[PDB]
Design an enzyme around this catalytic site. Structure first.
Site, short mmCIF file in Angstrom:
data_model
loop_
_atom_site.label_atom_id
_atom_site.label_comp_id
_atom_site.label_asym_id
_atom_site.label_seq_id
_atom_site.Cartn_x
_atom_site.Cartn_y
_atom_site.Cartn_z
N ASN A 198 0.85 -1.18 0.00
CA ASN A 198 0.00 0.00 0.00
C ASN A 198 0.89 1.24 0.00
O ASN A 198 1.89 1.30 0.71
CB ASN A 198 -0.89 0.00 1.24
CG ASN A 198 -1.89 -1.13 1.23
OD1 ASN A 198 -2.10 -1.78 0.20
ND2 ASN A 198 -2.52 -1.38 2.38
N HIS A 199 0.54 2.23 -0.81
CA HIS A 199 1.33 3.45 -0.88
C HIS A 199 0.65 4.48 0.02
O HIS A 199 -0.56 4.42 0.23
CB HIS A 199 1.35 4.02 -2.30
CG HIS A 199 2.41 3.45 -3.18
ND1 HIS A 199 3.27 4.23 -3.91
CD2 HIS A 199 2.81 2.17 -3.39
CE1 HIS A 199 4.16 3.47 -4.53
NE2 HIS A 199 3.89 2.21 -4.22
N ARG A 200 1.43 5.41 0.54
CA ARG A 200 0.88 6.46 1.38
C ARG A 200 0.05 7.31 0.40
O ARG A 200 0.50 7.61 -0.70
CB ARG A 200 2.00 7.27 2.01
CG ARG A 200 1.52 8.39 2.90
CD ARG A 200 2.68 9.17 3.49
NE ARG A 200 2.25 10.42 4.08
CZ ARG A 200 3.08 11.36 4.53
NH1 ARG A 200 4.39 11.18 4.45
NH2 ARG A 200 2.59 12.46 5.07
#
Lengths: 205, 207, 207
Positions: A81-83
């Site tokens: 998951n990316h910020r």
């Protein structure tokens, strides 16, 4: 009577059908149920089918008993998951001065745990996304992409996977969730396989 | 003129494109048309793309002529349907005594055979589910998952695949479904490829 | 400070992550931004992920800056479109007298150039069809099949991919579109990476 649930490869001579529990024991944040098996695509072990799972992140993967996992099924945890508060570009990834801009754990989005019920059938090449829960008895059609919860005893499929229909009427369903035959001792089960196979186990119960 | 339909690899010095009949014909409960081809993805032969096909279940796969099958296309037969009147767990699979609870053929129903029509263009990586029928002239978009029937000359796509739109008006399609140019002797086809290519083949025959 | 955008493999001792720009310098009709990178699935280079791209057709692929391309993303260009005004069967492909039936460019479908914005995050195994435009700041969920345009700063997914959600409200999006921090000399970017990361950059640059 029946296979040895402790055996990685239940069918002698066959290295394709494997029992998950033995295999995933060496791993953290993963609870697996006895008798759930994986049907290898290219002879791979089910542990390679679990992507982006890191202890530090602390999200869990749980799989019930008597589960049939088809070949190619992939489970995506939260390690990828990316910020998303601003730019999704992982600056820190490239160091050379950028590591200093590294997320704090509370800054990376965790969607939660991934739970897979008991007696669940997942068709081949099904992709399961982070933080999903698939109820007992459900059937996930081949090539589905599961992004949201699926209800117990529901037939589901697509990309995004959606619930198509109930496998049985609500009262029949209701009872199975009560009996929980999968939690019966190996011997009692061995003495009712056929009633469990044709759902008639409901009447005597 | 034209390639030899009996050749496995019609194009010289090219092991990617294959004619599907020479290859599949060799199998049970399978019928394939003469000019349908498969564009290999990694070098594999189309027979490797047909999964769970068991003679005992007695389900057939039919593929018409002049079909264009993209790389990676997968056709799933009924060999892997779990019984469903109760638990879907395959107890019998693990023997050790559990082999007595093996399904009786009539406890494993099937929707039907899988039939792909003539002049069908199936995109790359499309997955075809059991008991599906794809009509003549249909075009199936890449990465589609076909779960229900697709009508003749329709454009379909998605997972699940849905019919997006009709390719031509109803009359052009009904005329085509009539003319069946894919059924003409090679010699007559060679004479009209261009007319068959621009659909003007309808005015010559019909009118 | 910051990596050299010209290094094919920016991360020392790691042939998995690649900066797309240097890796695609060789291809034609392809434009890529400076810090966009690819996360290799099995070691393959990104040039292998772009399919059916023939200069002849003249369609182009544009990829902006600071993009995150997940492993296995596939970009399908127009060289795969069949002729559709009649049979979709490619006679010309088999030669032996059939080549004469080869299509004239203007007869061939061509949905246009494929355009990927800046700061776009494309998930795993996503397939991008031809003639599609993906707006800046968009996020494409793993396993999507993008058949149509995706507006800027939108969350999309599925097959066919559909816009699921607006990341921010319209005015924040517009401000971000007006600011274009990805077009800033890297010096300025370097001093604001954290404000760019939490979006506080909008408040400082707008008022």
């Amino acid at each position: 009577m029946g296979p040895n649930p402790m055996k990685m490869y239940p069918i002698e001579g066959n290295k394709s059908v494997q029992f998950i529990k033995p295999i995933l024991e060496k791993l953290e944040n993963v609870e697996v149920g006895e008798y759930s098996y994986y049907d290898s695509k290219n002879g791979e072990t089910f542990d390679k089918q679990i992507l982006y799972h890191y202890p530090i992140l602390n999200d869990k993967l749980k799989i019930g008993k008597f589960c049939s996992i088809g070949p190619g099924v992939t489970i995506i945890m939260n390690g990828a998951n990316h910020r998303m508060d601003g730019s999704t570009y992982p600056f820190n990834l490239f160091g050379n001065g950028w590591e200093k801009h590294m997320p704090k754990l509370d800054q990376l989005p965790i969607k939660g745990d991934t739970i897979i019920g008991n007696d669940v059938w997942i068709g081949k090449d099904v992709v399961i996304m982070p933080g999903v829960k698939i109820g007992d008895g459900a059937i996930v059609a081949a090539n589905s992409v599961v992004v949201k919860d699926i209800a117990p005893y529901m037939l589901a499929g697509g990309n995004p996977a959606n619930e198509i229909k109930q496998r049985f009427d609500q009262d029949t369903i209701n009872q199975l969730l009560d009996i929980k035959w999968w939690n019966w001792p190996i011997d009692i089960i061995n003495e009712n396989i056929d009633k469990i196979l044709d759902n008639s186990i409901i009447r005597e119960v």
